[PDB]
Structures are given as C-alpha cells and as structure tokens.
Design a protein around this ligand. Structure first.
Ligand SMILES: Nc1ccn([C@@H]2O[C@H](COP(=O)(O)OP(=O)(O)O)[C@@H](O)[C@H]2O)c(=O)n1
Ligand SMILES: Nc1ccn([C@@H]2O[C@H](COP(=O)(O)OP(=O)(O)O)[C@@H](O)[C@H]2O)c(=O)n1
Ligand SMILES: [Mg+2]
Ligand SMILES: [Mg+2]
Lengths: 193, 194
C-alpha cells in the first residue's frame, strides 16, 4: 500500500502537466505539512535510480521545504500514457470548498473546538490574513453570503461591501453589484457613501 | 497502509465542511473512476459499527455511482478536532492547473500519445465540450494565453476573443479587455464590431 519513500529517492517528471509553481501556495502547503504531515500519498513510478512522480510534485517539494526526509507514496506500475492520464485526473477531478464553506470551517474550529484564530492558521497552514478575512465574510447577511458562496460576488467584491454602514443598504448595493456585474473598482466607488 | 473497505461499511460525516455537492462534477468524478479507479485513498475514522469519512465524501459517492463495491481508504486514529482540521487541509491546500496547462495536457494526449479527443474525454472523465473548448484556447496568441494562464482573461473573455479574425487586433482587444477589466458582455460587443 503506502510506502514511506526517501525524498531523495524521488525525482520530478519534467514533462508533467503543471509548469507554474506558485511559491506562496507552496509555502502554505509546507506549513500544512508541518502541522499535519502529508495526508494523501503521492503517486510515483519506478524510474532510473529511484522513482519518478506521477502526481504530487507540490507535496514532494513542500515536504522537502519543511525538512521532512520521507514522503508517503503509492507505487503505480503504469505506462507513461496512463501515468500522464493519472496526473490530469488527480488535478482536474476536484471541487473546492466555496468561500462561505471555508469560512464556516474556520468558525467551527474557533467556536466549537475552541481554537484561537492563530491556532486555526497554524493547524490548517493558511495565512492569518486569509483566516481573518474569511471569518469577516460571516458578518454579511444571508442573501449576501449566498452570493459569495455561489460566486455571484467575488472575494474582492465582498471586501468592499464590508465597508457599507447600513446592512439594508449593504444588500441592495450588493445585489446591484452582482446583478449588473460591476467591477471591483466600481463597487468601491459605490461604497464610499 | 491502504485498505480496500466495502463502501457499505463507510458512512458520511454529517458535520463535514462541504455542504454543496455539484451533481455534474460528481458525474465527472464517477466517470474518471470508471476509467482509472480511485487514485487517492479516502481518509476515514472508525465510527459506530463501520467507518466515518474524514475526507473523501465525493470519491465515496462517485464510487457507488460507478458501481464499485469497495474504495481505497486510510484509517486514521484522530480526535474529532484533528479530523475536521484534516478535512479542511485536504480541500484547501491545493492548486489547480490553469486553463492553458489543462488544454496543453489534452493536446499532449492527442498529439504525443495519439488518443482521440473522444478518448481523452473517456480516460480523464471530462465532458466532450470541456475538452474541445480547452483545446480551442490554444489557437490564441502566446501573449493572450499567458493572460488566460494567469487569470487576467477569464474563460468567457477568451471565448469572445476567438471571434476576432485578425491576430493583431485580437491581441490589442485582449490587452484592452484585461487592462480595463471589461465585462464578458462588453468584450463581446467589441468583438462584433471588429
Ligand atoms: N498537509 C497536506 C496538504 C495537502 N495535501 C494534498 O495534497 C494535494 C495537493 O494537490 P496539488 O495538485 O495542489 O499538488 P500536488 O502535490 O498533487 O502536486 C491535495 O490532494 C491535497 O488534499 C496532503 O496530502 N497533505
Ligand atoms: N479517479 C479519481 C479522480 C479524483 N481523485 C481525487 O479525489 C479528490 C477529489 O477531491 P474533492 O475535494 O473534490 O472530493 P472528496 O473525494 O475529497 O470528497 C482529489 O484528490 C482528486 O485528486 C481520485 O482519487 N481518483
Ligand atoms: Mg496535483
Ligand atoms: Mg476533498
């Protein structure tokens, strides 16, 4: 099943589908690995003097960055066409939590499990600013949170709308922003009142 | 390590962070599982007379819909608080391929590995329209698909810009749309004039 493989025994697939590696997101992944370890084993292929990654290059890099010496892995015996299919499937067959689901998750850790916002940040590997801003979404009214949750309003839109003094005025402005589909800049000019 | 657990011995976590389950995405996941199996074991906790899911409810639902009788799983002995942390980490510590990376992946399966576009849809579990539309992005000029890659141009913005007949004017609208952050509808009106 799941081996613990030395990181030095594993090398990247130079032809893998991901070419861009966001350093800020790699940093968060590394922080989460320090807190929780790697939760899902990477997929590798025997190759050369060791193994070649099929899927899981970020996990491998982040583990290296955190100073871990091994990474959980599943060894797959596959053709390289199938290995490439696996790399696409692993990344493309996912559904993220929406921003309200994320924020309510942080809220449960604080309210129910009695973590501080600091502890949530450390335990999940997310920046303090990300945890704090998600929680602030939950001060919005239901209708407005619904528009954030379904994507009618973006993070940036929600940012600006938190400045509106009156909640009723806040909903109507939010509904226009989503309904007419205004830019974030137009929203902020609107919020100035 | 990884167990094959019977699906009927696994039940969901009613307090898990995800509350919305897109049916189309579950369908796609199920088709990918029919083609490839479950690639990443789900995380479960001993609970009642079976197991509770920590992370992986979609894989579990899709496996049932695919007709599997078992699912790969890792049994974790954790507190309730740690299990909820793991559920959040599993979903929030990810980075998607950008639209161009996705499109070039389909193109490699076709050009290098000699799959048909039909087979790409089957083997990766994506709708035929999704594969076709992604591939159509690669007709855009470098500078434009770079803006698609980094999110300067949305999917709808790219769709409209494919209607521009001349590449020099396509690039100039692309910069104008991305720099001014015009709406999709506005971008469409520009394209028709051109
Ligand atoms: N501490 C962590 C954080 C994320 N993950 C998983 O690692 C994967 C990250 O996916 P990704 O496509 O961004 O990066 P790769 O490692 O696949 O290259 C997700 O499946 C996350 O659930 C983990 O196994 N352990
Ligand atoms: N055939 C497949 C397709 C996706 N997956 C993985 O299953 C996970 C799906 O993530 P998700 O958050 O959308 O759904 P859950 O199964 O975690 O509830 C990703 O880590 C995908 O890489 C898999 O293991 N086998
Ligand atoms: Mg991946
Ligand atoms: Mg998940």
């Amino acid at each position: 099943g799941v081996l613990k493989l030395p990181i030095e025994s594993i090398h990247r697939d130079k032809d893998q589908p991901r070419t861009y590696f966001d350093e800020e997101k790699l940093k968060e992944l590394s922080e989460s690995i320090k807190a929780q370890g790697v939760l899902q084993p990477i997929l590798v292929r025997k190759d050369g003097d060791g193994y070649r990654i099929i899927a899981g290059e970020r996990r491998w890099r982040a583990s290296q960055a955190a100073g871990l010496k091994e990474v959980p892995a599943i060894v797959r015996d596959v053709t390289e066409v199938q290995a490439f299919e696996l790399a696409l499937v692993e990344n493309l067959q996912r559904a993220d939590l929406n921003p309200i689901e994320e924020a309510e998750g942080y809220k449960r850790l604080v309210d129910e499990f009695k973590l501080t916002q600091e502890q949530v940040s450390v335990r999940v590997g997310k920046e303090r600013s990300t945890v704090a801003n998600a929680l602030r979404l939950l001060a919005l009214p239901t209708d407005v949170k619904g528009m954030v949750a379904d994507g009618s309003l973006s993070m940036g839109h929600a940012r600006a709308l938190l400045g509106v003094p009156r909640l009723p005025e806040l909903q109507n402005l939010a509904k226009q922003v989503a309904d007419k589909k205004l830019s974030v800049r137009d929203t902020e000019r609107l919020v100035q009142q």
